[model samples]
Target: GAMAEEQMRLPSADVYRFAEPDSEENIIFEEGIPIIKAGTVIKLIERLTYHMYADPNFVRTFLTTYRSFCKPQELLSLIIERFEIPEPEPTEADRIAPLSAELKRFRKEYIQPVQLRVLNVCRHWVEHHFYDFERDAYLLQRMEEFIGTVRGKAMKKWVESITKIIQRKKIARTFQSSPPTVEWHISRPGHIETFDLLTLHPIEIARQLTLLESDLYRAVQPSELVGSVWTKEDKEINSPNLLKMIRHTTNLTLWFEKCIVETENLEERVAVVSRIIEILQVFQELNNFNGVLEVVSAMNSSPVYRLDHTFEQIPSRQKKILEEAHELSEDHYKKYLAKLRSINPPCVPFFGIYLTNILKTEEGNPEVLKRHGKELINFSKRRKVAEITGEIQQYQNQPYCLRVESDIKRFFENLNPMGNSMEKEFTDYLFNKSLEIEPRNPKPLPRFPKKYSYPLKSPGVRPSN
Candidate 1:
């Protein structure tokens, strides 16, 4: 069946004028066409021109395989060099052509599209195989230097984002560390079985809460993260665990506020604030990043935080501990990224941030797109979401191994964070409760610092118009 391999390697004729018979040697149309000739290295590289610019198939396939024969720097320089190919002198044939029209034609049909295609190749090369530029300083600079020369032009616009990303990629040597080494304290006597926050050690509380959040987090499927799914009525059904997680977190926040406002004594409130701070420290230790955020938010709420006397009653040791951990939430949780990078998993990752990132990626990029005769089903969008979801999965894979204490676990299950009345009334009740607890007389509210959180305030009370 597969005879005459040698004869098959023929250069197709410009015109098969005479006796064009369909022999067994003749193949069908689609596979019959060979785009590039088998030729020398430079000869093959030079074939990057002609009508190949718009040929997306040739551009992509060629760039993919060209690495064996041609170096990245060699291909890159040639791409730049070819872009500036000089115009030929006007001929007597110029009379047949309008003045400088062929010259313009050379720019339009030849150099311009070739230049665009060269960048298209660059876009493919750098984007698809970025480590090529990342590990190689010489190639990275060569591309950056070329881009610098064409700054603010269309050429720059097309290729610039990838170039900048490559530079950023080079510096960002990410090391997502090993999982939690200091294991959660599962055997603590009083801490494990206790209802009182003071009786429970910080590690036990963090461990138990971490397990709770992880169970909720681990239940979330990737399909549920599709942001538009969240915007619709099916959100509760599709994303039950996420809402549950958020609700639990809000409960943690409210429970902290409730303890502060409901307790009239200043010193006992110190105990609450101190224990919360210690638990946050354990969360940081256990890599329960999300757990830390809830406790932090609870303490920072206007209801609790304005109780200046209570926080002041919290010892300098606890206050300093709170201040240090406070850095994680600073600058919109900017430092938190590094903290996440530094830690290993079994951690309750800040789910809200991950969702925010995924939602934004969904919003910024279209779900499906049709471009240049290609039907692209936003795999790039899915790809980006997967990276985010993938990281989340990485964190969720190593679930906290702590044994759940039934009493504490039941307490967590029952702490519904919302709806004491109409949702707004519940919110208004908390705030009004807050003011009565710590009547505001703030000449100096004290500039400490802050983090990202969804406001728990519901709309019930309208100040009189």
Candidate 2:
């Protein structure tokens, strides 16, 4: 109101007494509906966002393109119209609540409308596959004519109905495909036999098991039974079977007594083993059956990528992929075993690395170590955590274990030079120089001229750096 009061009036246009044409009148064409299909518009949106966005260098290209089409008011109007949803005003009952409570209630009422609309849109896209014309023409046509505002609850139900109608066939097809493979499902007779008979990767078998494990676990649990009572302990225990399996692989029996004897620092030994265990878990998850199968299949192929049944020559890329996969497999397996042994406490009889270290480092009796050697090997190979922390702590303070520790430090002192040599060996193998061609234009053609002021260049940086 204050700004309006200070506004000044501008002079109006003068009325003509007798007007005549001063020059030839210009006429512009009234353009008809665009020849381009709505499908093309959708494709343009995807192309701009997906294909071009994938290129790390596309930001500049996108901005130049945006300069041609970024109309200020029009773009603003489109955004506002697309996302706007009206909120009902707070009712008189709100007046009874404190200011904070009233504001909180108001905020909920305001945001809920937008959230519901978004949820509806997501459901719609999932069902209609971005609401394409071919399969959803009728629904689109009906929607184009609808003018009324929809409430949150109403919109939600409408979205659910749309998804249900479109998704039922998908559900049917899923069931028809195959019975899901669960872990215990494989334990059943004829189950493992089926996998063994088939020419499939272990990764694929694992993938199938993962797919069904969720539902299988839910079905077998006490929750699945009627009137089952679950206490706080049930909630505390996470995926009991999964936790048990992980522990079976990671527990105390696998601790490396030898490394501990050598290292002397308890914390360092624990830290290294922890890091190893963490990496091992990551490797398993990332290279799990399905993921490993995908990675491995890509490696066996050539040219970095080649289609099925095609005769494409990609020798260099093929070699790179195969070598990387082989290295990854070997490294992961070895590191896994190393961490498994290093983390276990000193107890658990012949399995502890401390005793093994003594045999290697000092004048320890071979015959005495031999007696426990078989049992130790069995323990290391076994799939379970050896609960030996208490027993290991007792032996930890022993003079014999301490003497073995002193021998380990001496051994490392003698081996440091060799370790340095091994480091050089790895660096040489992995980062050796090879001939590489430099492209005058890293990105070529029409895109280049329109992009950089100067011509593009390639391979400017050395590989090692």
- List CA RMSD, all candidates: 20.1, 31.4
lDDT per residue for candidate 2 within 109-218, as digits (tens), equals 43344334433443433343321322345543443333123345546576556556445635654232443232221223333323220122222333332322222222
lDDT of each: 0.61, 0.28
lDDT of 1: 0.61
Model 1, span 147-199: residue lDDT tens: 66753345767766667666666677522544333222223443444354554
* Candidate 2 TM-score, C-alpha based: 0.17
Estimate TM-scores for all models. Answer: 0.52, 0.17
Clashes of 2: 10
Please report, as a residue range, the 10-residue window in candidate 1 with the lowest summed lDDT: 455-464
Q: State in Å the error of residue 363, model 1.
A: 2.8
